[PDB]
Amino acid sequence: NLNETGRVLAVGDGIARVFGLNNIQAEELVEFSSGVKGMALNLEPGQVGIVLFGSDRLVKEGELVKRTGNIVDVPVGPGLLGRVVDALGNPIDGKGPIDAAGRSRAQVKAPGILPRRSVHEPVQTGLKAVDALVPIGRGQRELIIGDRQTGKTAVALDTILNQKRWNNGSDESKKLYCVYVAVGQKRSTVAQLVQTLEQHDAMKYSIIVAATASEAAPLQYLAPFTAASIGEWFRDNGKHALIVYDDLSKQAVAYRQLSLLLRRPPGREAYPGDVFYLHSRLLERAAKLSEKEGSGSLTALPVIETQGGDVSAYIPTNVISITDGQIFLEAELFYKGIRPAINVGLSVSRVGSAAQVKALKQVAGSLKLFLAQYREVAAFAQFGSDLDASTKQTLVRGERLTQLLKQNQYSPLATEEQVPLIYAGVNGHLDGIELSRIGEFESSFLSYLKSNHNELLTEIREKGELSKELLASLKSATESFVATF
Amino acid sequence: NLNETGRVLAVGDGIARVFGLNNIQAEELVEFSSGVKGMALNLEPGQVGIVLFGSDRLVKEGELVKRTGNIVDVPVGPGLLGRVVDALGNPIDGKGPIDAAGRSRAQVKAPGILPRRSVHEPVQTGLKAVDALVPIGRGQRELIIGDRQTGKTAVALDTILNQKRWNNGSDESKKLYCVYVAVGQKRSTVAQLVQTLEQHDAMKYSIIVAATASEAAPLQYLAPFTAASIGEWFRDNGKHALIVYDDLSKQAVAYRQLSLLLRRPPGREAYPGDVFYLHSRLLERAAKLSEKEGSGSLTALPVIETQGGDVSAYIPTNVISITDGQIFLEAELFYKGIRPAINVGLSVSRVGSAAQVKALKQVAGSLKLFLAQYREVAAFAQFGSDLDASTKQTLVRGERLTQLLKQNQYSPLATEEQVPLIYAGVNGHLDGIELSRIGEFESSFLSYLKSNHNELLTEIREKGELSKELLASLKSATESFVATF
Amino acid sequence: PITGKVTAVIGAIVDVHFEQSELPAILNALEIKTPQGKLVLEVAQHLGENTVRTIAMDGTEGLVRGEKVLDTGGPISVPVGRETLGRIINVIGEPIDERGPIKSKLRKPIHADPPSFAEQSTSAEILETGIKVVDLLAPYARGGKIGLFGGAGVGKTVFIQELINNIAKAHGGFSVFTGVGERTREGNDLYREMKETGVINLEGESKVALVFGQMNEPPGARARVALTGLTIAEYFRDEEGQDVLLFIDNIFRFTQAGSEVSALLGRIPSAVGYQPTLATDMGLLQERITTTKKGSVTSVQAVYVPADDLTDPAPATTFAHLDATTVLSRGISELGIYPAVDPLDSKSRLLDAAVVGQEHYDVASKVQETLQTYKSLQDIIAILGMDELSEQDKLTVERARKIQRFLSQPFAVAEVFTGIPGKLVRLKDTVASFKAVLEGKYDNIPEHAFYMVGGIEDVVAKAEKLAAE
């Protein structure tokens, strides 16, 4: 029965040619007698072309191959929470087998124009710079882009760690479940990230999908799609998920390799011509659904490595043309010790301003533009020219605000704690505080507010909004503290 | 009988396809019925691909091909001394047949890690700048690298000419037989070089291998390997040989031609990826053997042309990464009339410092570092006003030494003659001499020193080293001459 | 035994027809018997028609179609453990010293999967090198990966030999040196230096195992030899439980050899003619080098950079894998600043105030900002000279020149080229010296006193010598 089985004619470079499998579907999964799995990419009049997820070395000419009947798919459901999986959803944490709500195809078509909704509710990162200047909403696709070691993963991980505030509550409309995808990362790096998420108890609501550089290029190509299908299970049920792809550029490299092994000619920068379609059909799967579709959401945070900060390069500009905005992380700011080093000029959220917390919008106001103006002024003032009138004043406040935006890793702030900080900074109360003490100001002021004005912080938290009386009370608290500080 | 003979199927781009030759060895040599020869490069179940050592015009489809029965090999032995041969070792001087001790494969593996020894005895070039600043040991590989017309061949030819002061003696361990390989040079240039050697009587101990600009690229590629096999007979029989590869850039160009006509994928600068393997498997064959292996040695001097002086180009950086140092000849110096134009900063001998003549090591001292410092001091001091005494003495001493290192073509000095000159320059006794009279000093001082103090020169030659008494008497001789001069 | 006839021969590539139901698996080793010794072929592909395609670990000259190949039944397998110490091994595990068989109890396949997800471990121990520019600006991690990047001749082998002298006999466990596609002369000189220093004793215990496949070797051997060295290092890490330091002289030669065989295989090339699978090839090699819970493995890897082009796919692929990278620049070496380390392009994971301490992080950051300011000025300075600068710029540039000149250091292995004897400078002494320089405390000292000296006390001594002269 060569309808349901076939024989390997040839195999090498992780590609095998199979005779038979006459009934096989395109993109079906096959299993080899040696036990490796492979995906049927090419159906041809006398042969099938299978790409191998495991190593070829076990496969031999004349191996029996059998077809699963399933398009390449992965287990999905809540039973993956707290698990580390390979690109095919096999557990690699060494715990027991996974329990799944079902299986979902890796390649599924994104929800169209009708089922989607505008982005209107926040992904609270707890990063002062993100939540104030480039707010992200649930269902947004905000790119994270920058050079290596500029803090991209730290931004994503602090975002995941913040969700511990809500994921312990009952209100599953607020709970945000997280997926993280390692593509081409060292096993060392992803194991250390798992150990960090374990330290912060974040694993109990997180899922990690890992295709490390040891893994075959088909696995590194596939891993983002199956991670997206896992996040989509939450979206489609009506829950909210966040998905981080800690390098799409490494997926694009793996897909370039796979395309060359398929003998497909390269295009621009030697990437295959459909390297855009690879990322776009991935990222279009992040969406906010309408109430008829159950209100669920999937939020994406793709990561891109720039070379020398060159955002004009082909893959950076491709992903920028998909991602509803970007957070740009600047090496000059990072190595100057301004961490998280978010460049306030080049970072913009195209849709999350509708989803920003209202109290934080009220207190932040023009701050996003003001910091860019400050950065231009500082770039001229470093020439040592005369700084008279507003130039002096804008240099003072812009320095203190910049000193107010830097933040310690793995210490995301509650929004009720960002609101008084951004209020005190924007209204210039920090103009009297010397620049070395601004971190002390944050630590003691939140200690004062949390000790003496907890009523204000609870009302800010529960309402998400300032009344004129609540804003006046926050003014009196800030003025009193700065008077004492 | 298709076992030992075959039929040409196709002919083009220097490649003939042959049916039969079932028993042919890979890289065996074949003879076509027209009497042209070819190497069998690749073997296939149906056919053999053969690289013609000649014009495609000499081979036609349907012609008979015969095995020669042996891998591409060259005659070797002392009977080649005084002869000019093609890349296959056929005589082209027309002086008659070659006399050979045997035949040796063109491709043969370089001696391994254990049969080698460190280089510990000099190749005395008789060039003041080389013997003083960048000494070459027997068994070294020293790259000569230059722009066009900068003196590369003159440096190698003067090295070859200097040997006749030992190659006419009885002491077979001091003799150094020479091999010179002309690759892509004009036949007229080679014939004039042979005339130059023969009128200086340097031919009686020299062998010249020629694959000139018209000769097919497979012959130009092969010619360095067969010249290496000729030098290896001396290396392996306990004699010393020097091999000059008078352009390895032209061998690389011939190998690029051959590889691209084979439809090999082009790499950087369209050279094939294994162009490094082409040069390294060549230059690894120059070695100094241990006393168990008979102490013999083969020294190599490859030669390279850098377009626009770019030492960062692909082939230059490849050969720099293979050889044990380089002599860099600067076009600016050569056109300023500083000849042989050795740049003292960019040239370095990475292993031959242990092989320098100890008397030269004693009298040169830090001379290389001093001349490198002098060049950078003179660079600013060309415009810099108000030079200090330190910079003034640096300029005086460096101009004296620069004039002292100039040397006329075909005029290599003995080390007994180099030592007094370098002593006089380094100790600053020239500082009072007028900058134009230094050439007058050089010839007149040696003439005095030969006539009056011959004992010192003979003692330097016989011992190779200066005792404190010989330094004192050479100081007396120098100071009395400068007192007269 | 499974035997097959040679049917095609193309450089290093040999096709073998096995004429029977069972073929050798991929990565199996096959043997041909040869007028001298044997040729080893490693299987790379199944072509169909019972024909496998294989890569040759030695020269294929003299092979005949129809010549007989025999499957050994497993991959290339190399001797492992303490019996490999003090001895020199080729890519196929044979001794290439004269000292007879290696006679180890175990032999282990050179192809293996990396450590599992549960076996990973990671350190933040700084490895003190004694090299000022490294110890200050890119401190190496013990148990981490270090790469040295440079074009031809810029100093990376001298750097590796200085590291071997300073670290390797201070390190408590074993060492492994793999030479991939570098000079056979450099290997013989290393073997002699190891015997003279005593890291090898031919009549005693030895701390280092040597694996060589030099630039005279075919591309198959230069490709696989790194896996033999790594398999020995992995055996010491896992089976002995030892802390290993693995040196790999010129890992680029492994990658380039992968391109050469790939060109004969007939794959469509990536980038400037490199193989596809360049990234996964590097991942499979480079992931095995990790430290694990069983034992630490430090490794120092030199990386040649063709035409000095750091954009070349092989350097750019390697940069992703390394915990510390040292970039050696031809321009810096031409200024005579040895060891030629670019202070700004060299970076480390361990340059973190939580790891180096806040004082060291501050000194390194102020040095980096000073040198980056100087680099920003250097073209204005080139056109107009230093006189157009501001007084703040003139001071910053003078101090940047002093600092970069002070990052030079005489290595003990290279005193033949410098005359000055070698110096080791302690990490604490380095940080105190550069902080005192940043304070401007020595702005009156001439730049020459900073050049090529072993710390600030030597700067003061040299400045005194210059002022007396």
Ligand SMILES: CCC[C@H](O)[C@@H](C)C(=O)NC/C=C\C[C@@H](C)[C@@H](O)[C@H](C)[C@@H]1C/C=C\C[C@H](C)[C@H](O)Cc2cc(OC)cc(O)c2C(=O)O1
């Ligand atoms: C990864 C690469 C990214 C890529 O390089 C980039 C082009 C991209 O892709 N996206 C950025 C998209 C939106 C951000 C802008 C809307 C805006 O938020 C910022 C602050 C800009 C910053 C520019 C100058 C500051 C100056 C003081 C200005 O004059 C400030 C300013 C004042 C003003 O008056 C009310 C109105 C303005 O729009 C601006 C202004 O544009 O500033």
Ligand SMILES: CCC[C@H](O)[C@@H](C)C(=O)NC/C=C\C[C@@H](C)[C@@H](O)[C@H](C)[C@@H]1C/C=C\C[C@H](C)[C@H](O)Cc2cc(OC)cc(O)c2C(=O)O1
């Ligand atoms: C075609 C490729 C070129 C390639 O770019 C180059 C790197 C290469 O391939 N080979 C040259 C490698 C080593 C040779 C050196 C040991 C040494 O001979 C020379 C003169 C260097 C020249 C540099 C600056 C001069 C300056 C006065 C310095 O300050 C002089 C100096 C002083 C000193 O004090 C003891 C120590 C030193 O090492 C130096 C020094 O480096 O000078």
Ligand SMILES: Nc1ncnc2c1ncn2[C@@H]1O[C@H](COP(=O)(O)OP(=O)(O)OP(=O)(O)O)[C@@H](O)[C@H]1O
């Ligand atoms: N806010 C911060 N404060 C202090 N250190 C930080 C901060 N953000 C990041 N870092 C540190 O910066 C270094 C690099 O940042 P991170 O770990 O996020 O890597 P990355 O930018 O994702 O880089 P890569 O390309 O290597 O994955 C790490 O040491 C991280 O600890």
Ligand SMILES: Nc1ncnc2c1ncn2[C@@H]1O[C@H](COP(=O)(O)OP(=O)(O)OP(=O)(O)O)[C@@H](O)[C@H]1O
């Ligand atoms: N020491 C010297 N003194 C005077 N003239 C010299 C000296 N060395 C070389 N020349 C002359 O300079 C020119 C260089 O000739 P040479 O054969 O050395 O060239 P080359 O550098 O090998 O270049 P090419 O092969 O491209 O012609 C010739 O005119 C030679 O006569």
Ligand SMILES: Nc1ncnc2c1ncn2[C@@H]1O[C@H](COP(=O)(O)OP(=O)(O)OP(=O)(O)O)[C@@H](O)[C@H]1O
């Ligand atoms: N720290 C140093 N001190 C003194 N001289 C040095 C130093 N580093 C390099 N050099 C000099 O520069 C050259 C370095 O040669 P080396 O073999 O170390 O280079 P490499 O980068 O390994 O080159 P290759 O590509 O040929 O393998 C030699 O001339 C050596 O004298």
Ligand SMILES: [Mg+2]
């Ligand atoms: Mg990261």
Ligand SMILES: [Mg+2]
């Ligand atoms: Mg010439």
Ligand SMILES: [Mg+2]
């Ligand atoms: Mg080297």
